[PDB]
Design a protein around this motif. Structure first.
Motif, mmCIF file in Angstrom:
data_model
loop_
_atom_site.group_PDB
_atom_site.id
_atom_site.type_symbol
_atom_site.label_atom_id
_atom_site.label_comp_id
_atom_site.label_asym_id
_atom_site.label_seq_id
_atom_site.Cartn_x
_atom_site.Cartn_y
_atom_site.Cartn_z
ATOM 1 N N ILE A 1 16.571 -4.605 15.663
ATOM 2 C CA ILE A 1 16.063 -3.377 15.064
ATOM 3 C C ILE A 1 14.538 -3.311 14.963
ATOM 4 C CG2 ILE A 1 18.099 -3.745 13.586
ATOM 5 C CD1 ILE A 1 15.592 -1.610 12.069
ATOM 6 N N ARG A 3 10.984 -1.154 13.951
ATOM 7 C CA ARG A 3 10.481 -0.211 12.991
ATOM 8 C C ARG A 3 9.197 0.367 13.485
ATOM 9 N NH1 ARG A 3 10.770 -4.500 8.123
ATOM 10 N NH2 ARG A 3 11.654 -5.906 9.670
ATOM 11 N N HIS A 31 7.377 -3.266 13.309
ATOM 12 C CA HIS A 31 7.923 -4.492 13.878
ATOM 13 C C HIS A 31 8.500 -4.138 15.250
ATOM 14 C CE1 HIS A 31 10.181 -8.259 14.285
ATOM 15 N NE2 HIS A 31 9.527 -8.719 13.233
ATOM 16 N N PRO A 32 8.212 -4.950 16.288
ATOM 17 C CA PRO A 32 7.410 -6.189 16.294
ATOM 18 C C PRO A 32 5.893 -5.972 16.132
ATOM 19 C CG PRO A 32 8.152 -5.659 18.551
ATOM 20 C CD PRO A 32 8.830 -4.671 17.601
ATOM 21 N N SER A 61 7.588 -6.998 8.022
ATOM 22 C CA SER A 61 6.865 -6.058 8.847
ATOM 23 C C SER A 61 5.371 -6.390 8.765
ATOM 24 C CB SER A 61 7.165 -4.614 8.425
ATOM 25 O OG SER A 61 6.537 -4.248 7.211
#
Ligand SMILES: *[C@@H](C)/C=N/c1c(NC[C@H](O)[C@H](O)[C@H](O)CO)[nH]c(=O)[nH]c1=O
Lengths: 98, 264
Positions: A1, A3, A31-32, A61
């Motif tokens: 996942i 973000r 993220h990453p 994050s």
């Protein structure tokens, strides 16, 4: 996942046209870690821009602060341009001038 | 006042160029204090009061440790990826640290994450690792079989970490322990017809921890309050706000001082 970054653009002090200030672009919750950020004045990249090192949040994050010294005018428009793997193309976020 | 010391490690497999394979940085509260990565291969200060107070021997010794930790992190990420049958680029993260609370009690924590999600969480009170899935459970069993390492980490969290923090707090006291009070104002405006928005805005304050709320007739609100993030202003101080719709008053507490702004 993954973000996608939250992007917030704001002045250091309450803005007033004519008075020296600082423009911040705070980029967070992503993220990453790989990320690209520029400040823009009237669509063009500003070159004398400070930034913090990549920073780590408890929720894993990352976050960053880009800033530049500026004097706001009614005419000029400033923005923050960001690219990240969650983005198809760079996202340009306009400063809302308070 | 509450303070904390923490170190992160970040490992990336198959990174893009420009992205180090490994980074480790330390924080006291919100302030970066140390940094290492797989490109510099050197531990360096990130705060002037760290540089002025730790002799070169400190940086040398921990540089060697970090070079060792960098290689372990690479291998652990590879083993995780294999466990998950993952290819391509993935991330691995560690956070360790402690808090010295106001009342004098203490806190310690040690956690790992895989691709930015909770993976393993240490409980120093049980000397056990909490695993989020069967892969983490596999890792947990190995780690929990080494009783000495668990004892060692409990000691580091509860004693060593706290001692480092107190040490650093003294080094950076002119920064870490100062107070800069908030400048606070309320702004009123009719937005949508009929509507009146009320913004309570604070800036110029340090430390970043601030409490802002809206109240009506001297008691708690129930309507929707919107909160601005606490954001760095770039000069060592922070800013934040809170808004509602529409006798109202904004209440602000910061470092032992309470402030009320009555909306006329
Ligand atoms: C300079 C002191 C950098 N330290 C550092 C540490 N230090 C904390 C602790 O000794 C270490 O995490 C041990 O592994 C705990 O058992 N940790 C870290 O992750 N990065 C650092 O740069």
């Amino acid at each position: 996942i993954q973000r996608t970054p939250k992007i917030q653009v704001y002045s250091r002090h309450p803005a007033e046209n004519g008075k020296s200030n600082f423009l911040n672009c705070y980029v967070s919750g992503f993220h990453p870690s790989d990320i690209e950020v520029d400040l823009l004045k009237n669509g063009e990249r500003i070159e004398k821009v400070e930034h913090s090192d990549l920073s780590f949040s408890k929720d894993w994050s990352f976050y960053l602060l880009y800033y530049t010294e500026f004097t706001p005018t009614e005419k000029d428009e400033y923005a923050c341009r960001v690219n990240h793997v969650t983005l198809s193309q760079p996202k340009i976020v306009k400063w809302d001038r308070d | 006042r509450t303070h904390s010391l923490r170190y992160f490690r970040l490992g990336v497999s198959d990174p893009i160029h420009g992205v180090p394979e490994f980074i480790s940085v330390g924080y006291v509260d919100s302030h970066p204090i140390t940094t290492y990565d797989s490109v510099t291969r050197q531990k360096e200060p990130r705060a002037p009061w760290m540089a002025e107070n730790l002799a070169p021997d400190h940086w040398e010794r921990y540089t060697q440790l970090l070079r060792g930790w960098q290689q372990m992190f690479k291998v652990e990420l590879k083993r995780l990826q294999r466990h998950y049958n993952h290819s391509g680029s993935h991330t691995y993260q560690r956070m360790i640290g402690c808090e010295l609370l106001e009342d004098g009690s203490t806190t310690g924590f040690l956690q790992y994450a895989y691709d930015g999600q909770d993976f393993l969480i240490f409980n120093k009170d049980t000397l056990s690792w909490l695993a989020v899935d069967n892969v983490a459970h596999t890792i947990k069993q190995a780690w929990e079989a080494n009783q000495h390492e668990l004892l060692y980490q409990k000691n580091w969290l509860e004693e060593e970490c706290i001692a480092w923090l107190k040490r650093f707090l003294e080094y950076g006291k002119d920064t870490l322990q100062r107070t800069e009070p908030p400048l606070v104002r309320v702004n009123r405006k009719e937005t949508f017809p009929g509507v009146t928005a009320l913004f309570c805005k604070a800036h110029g304050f340090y430390p970043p921890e601030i409490y802002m709320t809206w109240m009506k007739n001297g008691e708690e609100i129930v309507q929707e309050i919107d909160y601005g993030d606490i954001l760095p202003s770039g000069d060592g101080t922070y800013q934040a706000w809170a808004s509602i719709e529409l006798l109202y008053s904004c209440h602000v507490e910061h470092s032992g001082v309470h402030m009320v702004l009555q909306v006329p």
